[PDB]
Amino acid sequence: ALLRILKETEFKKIKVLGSGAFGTVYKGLWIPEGEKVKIPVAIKELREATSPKANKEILDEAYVMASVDNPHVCRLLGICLTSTVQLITQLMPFGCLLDYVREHKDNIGSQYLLNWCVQIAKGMNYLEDRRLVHRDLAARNVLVKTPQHVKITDFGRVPIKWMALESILHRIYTHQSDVWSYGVTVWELMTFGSKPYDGIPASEISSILEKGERLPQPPICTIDVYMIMRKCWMIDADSRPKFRELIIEFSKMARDPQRYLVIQGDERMHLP
Ligand SMILES: O=C(Nc1nccs1)[C@@H](c1ncn2c1CCC2)N1Cc2c(cc(C#Cc3ccc(CN4CCC(CO)CC4)cc3)cc2C(F)(F)F)C1=O
Structure with missing residues (x-):
C-alpha cells in the first residue's frame, strides 16, 4: 500500500527490544486514528536523523519500504516525524x-x-x-x-x-x-x-x-x-x-x- 504518516499520539512505546547501528527498537501499540483496532508494532527510532538532506533521503527510501507486498517480506507500515524519525512495522512477536x-x-x-x-x-x-x-x-x-x-x-x-x-x-x-x-x-x-x-x-x-x-x-x-x-x-x-x-x-x-x-x-x- 502506502506509507502512513503517523501522529505521535497514535502509538505508545512499551518496552525496549534492542538497539543497532541505526537506532533503538521498541515494542509498542498502535491504535490507528479513527479505528478501534489496536496493532502491536515494532518502532525504530533513528539516532541523530535530523539533517534536512538525510530527512529527505529517509522519506524517499521509506516510500519504497512501504511498497513491498509479499507474505515473506516485512513491509514498513508508517513513519512518525517529530524531533526524531520513528519507523513502524507490525510486531513479529517471536x-x-x-x-x-x-x-x-x-x-x-x-x-x-x-x-x-x-x-x-x-x-x-x-x-x-x-x-x-x-x-x-x-x-x-x-x-x-x-x-x-x-x-x-x-x-x-x-x-x-x-x-x-x-x-x-x-x-x-x-x-x-x-x-x-x-x-x-x-x-x-x-x-x-x-x-x-x-x-x-x-x-x-x-x-x-x-x-x-x-x-x-x-x-x-x-x-x-x-x-x-x-x-x-x-x-x-x-x-x-x-x-x-x-x-x-x-x-x-x-x-x-x-x-x-x-x-x-x-x-x-x-x-x-
Ligand atoms: O525500519 C526498519 N526496521 C524496523 N524494525 C522495527 C521497526 S522499523 C528497516 C527496514 N528495512 C526494510 N524494511 C524495514 C522495516 C520493514 C521493511 N529500516 C528502514 C530504514 C532504516 C534506516 C533508515 C535510515 C537512516 C539514516 C540516514 C542518515 C543518517 C545520518 N547520517 C549518519 C552518518 C552518515 C555517514 O556514514 C551520513 C548519514 C542517519 C540515519 C531509513 C530507513 C527507511 F528505508 F525506511 F527509510 C531501517 O533500519
Missing part, C-alpha cells in the same frame, strides 16, 4: 529467526528448516522482482511471525562473514551477492544458529575465500542440501543459483524432509 533457532534447537525438525529456506527464497525472489537488493541478508534479519511463517527485513539501502567475495573486495552488491548471503543464512539454520567462520578474524575472510575455503557441511545436511549452499558461494556471481531456482529446489526437498536432512540421536553431534 523475534528473529537466529534467536528462535538457538532457543528451540532441541525440538526443531527437518520440515521446519526446509520450509524456512523456501520462504526466505520466496521473499528474496520478490525483492529481486522489485529490483531491491538486500545487502545484509542473515538469519538475524529474518523475523518469525509464527514458527510456520518467517519474513525478511532490514533490506534496501560490515558483515564480512555473510558477504560475497566481490562485495568484500570490490563493494559490488547485486541480487547475486544476495544469493551468497542466502547460502550463509541457510548454513546458520542447518547448524542451529552457529556463527560462520567462528574464531577466524574478519580481516582474513577474503584470503580464505580466495584460497577456495568455505563453510563446512552441517552434520544434519545430506549432500544434496550442502551442494545448494556450495553453489551460492561460487566466485563467479553468474554461476550461483537464482532465487527462483532456490524456491524450486528447496520446495522439492520440503516434500520429503527426512530424505534431505537427518536429525537423529545425539544432538551434541549436530554441531559443525
Whole structure:
C-alpha cells in the first residue's frame, strides 16, 4: 500500500527490544486514528536523523519500504516525524529467526528448516522482482511471525562473514551477492544458529575465500542440501543459483524432509 504518516499520539512505546547501528527498537501499540483496532508494532527510532538532506533521503527510501507486498517480506507500515524519525512495522512477536533457532534447537525438525529456506527464497525472489537488493541478508534479519511463517527485513539501502567475495573486495552488491548471503543464512539454520567462520578474524575472510575455503557441511545436511549452499558461494556471481531456482529446489526437498536432512540421536553431534 502506502506509507502512513503517523501522529505521535497514535502509538505508545512499551518496552525496549534492542538497539543497532541505526537506532533503538521498541515494542509498542498502535491504535490507528479513527479505528478501534489496536496493532502491536515494532518502532525504530533513528539516532541523530535530523539533517534536512538525510530527512529527505529517509522519506524517499521509506516510500519504497512501504511498497513491498509479499507474505515473506516485512513491509514498513508508517513513519512518525517529530524531533526524531520513528519507523513502524507490525510486531513479529517471536523475534528473529537466529534467536528462535538457538532457543528451540532441541525440538526443531527437518520440515521446519526446509520450509524456512523456501520462504526466505520466496521473499528474496520478490525483492529481486522489485529490483531491491538486500545487502545484509542473515538469519538475524529474518523475523518469525509464527514458527510456520518467517519474513525478511532490514533490506534496501560490515558483515564480512555473510558477504560475497566481490562485495568484500570490490563493494559490488547485486541480487547475486544476495544469493551468497542466502547460502550463509541457510548454513546458520542447518547448524542451529552457529556463527560462520567462528574464531577466524574478519580481516582474513577474503584470503580464505580466495584460497577456495568455505563453510563446512552441517552434520544434519545430506549432500544434496550442502551442494545448494556450495553453489551460492561460487566466485563467479553468474554461476550461483537464482532465487527462483532456490524456491524450486528447496520446495522439492520440503516434500520429503527426512530424505534431505537427518536429525537423529545425539544432538551434541549436530554441531559443525
Ligand atoms: O525500519 C526498519 N526496521 C524496523 N524494525 C522495527 C521497526 S522499523 C528497516 C527496514 N528495512 C526494510 N524494511 C524495514 C522495516 C520493514 C521493511 N529500516 C528502514 C530504514 C532504516 C534506516 C533508515 C535510515 C537512516 C539514516 C540516514 C542518515 C543518517 C545520518 N547520517 C549518519 C552518518 C552518515 C555517514 O556514514 C551520513 C548519514 C542517519 C540515519 C531509513 C530507513 C527507511 F528505508 F525506511 F527509510 C531501517 O533500519
